[PDB]
Design a protein around this ligand. Structure first.
Ligand SMILES: [Ca+2]
Ligand SMILES: [Ca+2]
Ligand code: NA
Ligand code: NA
Ligand code: NA
Ligand code: NA
Lengths: 155, 153
DNA sequence: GCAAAACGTCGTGAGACAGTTTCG
DNA sequence: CGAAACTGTCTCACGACGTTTTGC
């Protein structure tokens, strides 16, 4: 696990509080046992003329990548271990997104047990609902209730 | 002048780089010698649900105020002396808005001189043009050329 | 089956001005 | 006069999702 410098973490926490997204999703996908994938993403978006800054984040954080979507680009970090390590170090300095960060860390820690039982999987999905509620969510479709119905129509 | 803690400045520089605006404007106004006001503003906007963070900035920076404009609110710092003191301490940690911050400091230092000569006023107006070019400017109207035309006439 | 990447999109939450007014 | 406040709104630069594909 990479140990990050404190001044970098302080700066990045301010950047993330004002212009970062800590996202948790439940993605319908038939290849999974409970028919959904639990997905977590740390994202930093910038107008494409500033993509260089996002490329530099890839070098500084040491993981992740950047994708382009036209007028803007996004730094994306979704690998679970690196994400846990990064958010663990960043969270003490967050003022606006600390609760989302901690809920993501909680989810990551319970992923192994969530795979073992439908009731635990559903509980972890309610934590995803909690993150969405803290975020400025506007176009969400798959929720813990979507999952509850599927699990019931399976058992 | 207030001396700020480095940890606060590091955090706020990150916040400003991603969600801050360093604004310079030339405002047509007949009560001024050169018929325009040179205006500088440091602004931090948030959805109103998070205006509490802006209210805390007023206490932490120690000057400025919050205004509400519907769905969002803005922390506003326009007083020149406190603005110069604040940006002087914040700029070493800025990575995306350092150029705008330093141009604002330069403008502030030259305000006294800009009021004694048309050419000097215009020179400072060109530094305002530079800040707007660095920003994601989209609805700007009054530029150094606007002023140049007014003064010539 | 699951991690992770790849690709795609609705509706802002800001960003950056503009115009007008106050009062030491 | 002139610094600073008061007030308004256009146009994004994101924010937070969504769906599909890759491959061990
Ligand atoms: Ca923001
Ligand atoms: Ca931004
Ligand atoms: Na919300
Ligand atoms: Na620009
Ligand atoms: Na006054
Ligand atoms: Na893989």
């Amino acid at each position: 696990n990479t140990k990050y410098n404190k001044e970098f973490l302080l700066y990045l926490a301010g950047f993330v509080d004002g212009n970062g997204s800590i996202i948790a999703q439940i993605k319908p996908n038939q290849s999974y046992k409970f028919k959904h994938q639990l997905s977590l993403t740390f994202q930093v978006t910038q107008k494409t003329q500033r993509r260089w800054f996002l490329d530099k984040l890839v070098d500084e954080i040491g993981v992740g990548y950047v994708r382009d979507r036209g007028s803007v680009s996004d730094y994306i970090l979704s690998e679970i271990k690196p994400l846990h390590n990064f958010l663990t170090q960043l969270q003490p300095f967050l003022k606006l997104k600390q609760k989302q960060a901690n809920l993501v860390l909680k989810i990551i820690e319970q992923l192994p047990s969530a795979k073992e039982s439908p009731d635990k999987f559903l509980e972890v999905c309610t934590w995803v609902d909690q993150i969405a509620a803290l975020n400025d969510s506007k176009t969400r479709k798959t929720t813990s209730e979507t999952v509850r119905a599927v699990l019931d129509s399976l058992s």
